[PDB]
Amino acid sequence: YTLRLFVIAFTKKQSNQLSKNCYAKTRLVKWVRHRITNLIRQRLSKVNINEAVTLLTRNILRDRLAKRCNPIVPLRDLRIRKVKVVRTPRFDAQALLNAHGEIP
Amino acid sequence: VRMQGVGHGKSASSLPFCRTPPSWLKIASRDVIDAVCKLAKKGLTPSRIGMQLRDSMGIAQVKNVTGRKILRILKHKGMAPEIPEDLYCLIKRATEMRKHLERNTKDRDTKFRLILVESRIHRLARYYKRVKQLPPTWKYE
RNA sequence: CAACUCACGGCAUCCAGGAAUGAAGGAGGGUAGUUCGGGGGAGAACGUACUGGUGCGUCAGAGGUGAAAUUCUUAGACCGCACCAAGACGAACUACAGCGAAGGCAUUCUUCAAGGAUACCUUCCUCAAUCAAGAACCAAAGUGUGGGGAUCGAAGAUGAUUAGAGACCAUUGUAGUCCACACUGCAAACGAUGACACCCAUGAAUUGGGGAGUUUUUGGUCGUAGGCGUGGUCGGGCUUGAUUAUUAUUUUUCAUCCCGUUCCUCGUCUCGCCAAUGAAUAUUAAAUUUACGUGCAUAUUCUUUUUGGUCUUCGUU
Question: Is B81-141 in CATH node 1.10.287.10?
């Protein structure tokens, strides 16, 4: 399985800020997107299919992501905007049925 | 205002009112002049030598102690460059841009620039034949 | 030829008597901050949407307008779902914000050369300003050759409205819109404000860079009291450079290459005694400036394993 995880985030004003700009530089931005791609390719590399989806659905990833990110520049939200599948492994009976367990 | 661009800079250096050298220096003339020429042998230009020599040896303005300036020193020892630093710099720059354009023919910005550079070459050259320091047979390309 | 107080003399002899005003709130050139930005070119991917197609369902309307008609349909339109194709474009975020000499420039990553600002006790020492001639660049529309053709669309066609409508409106449609290579130099190309330099009152705001500082020079005895580092002497190793070596005439054969203290010379640091910047009885444009605190903060990885050791299942006692 081979995937795409669209993301999105936004900057956040400091609590004592008196300025009506919140705008970032360029280097700042790029770091975030660097240190995003890396992590989502490091966690999911050694994690299998059914093992993966359970992270995304419950928003486990979002925790580990944002809590790294924040001291690069402050973030207001991070979300996973959309998730998509590209290349699939070929059909199997057992790997399938073993992932549903009992069938009601 | 900038010579053939636009911009106003004011980044600058202002050396002190006193033209006498510090108390704390333990060099004298000899020591200085040595270190100048010595580093010149590497292929440093006057600029680079002076910067190295403030950051290691604490001699700020060479002229104050040695009683003469970097380029004079090197001329007397025959290590001064045949084509002077300032224009040679330009020429080097220009060539690189020309190389780039042999592969990048839809680039426009680069060529606007190249004009400006080549122009500047001329003007400098003409003040190094007004002031004798080049042959009169000098030419760019 | 050497030796040889000092002199004459000989030596493609050397350095110093600062030997050449200053370093413009002019220009140029350096060095640095992974500096700064929808600046420019190239390559690789991404995103929905419009349009077309294929498959799977349903069944009679759908388009369109003020009201209609032109138009498409039981050969299944329109609509719903999945997928594929092709060309163009990059929403919201996007602003009295950024970059570029203008015209102009918004997806992401990689890459190629450039430019501006700031910082400097760096270098050079008037190299500059402006501008007939000449040269380069230049929105959109147009012209040529080849390619592309999804969307919109001059010309044209059909349907309306109107006294008339070859107009606004509806459905279509060629050139064009896109790309490459040549041509053109015609804009409300506008801030309707030519370029360069100086002087000049006020309160908030915004983009980029940099800074936020208070006991020194040590002089004289330089005084080995100590330490550190370098070059010399034996020693160790080294076919070190000349070199027995290399055939075990291996016999070396030495200052030496690489290592090498208790030795001499030199550099520097530590330690030291003394000396150097802190005395008000009255103030004319001031001799010394706030603050210095908050919020966030990686086990941050893959392992192939192989020698034991806990287990298990066959034969046999």
Answer: yes
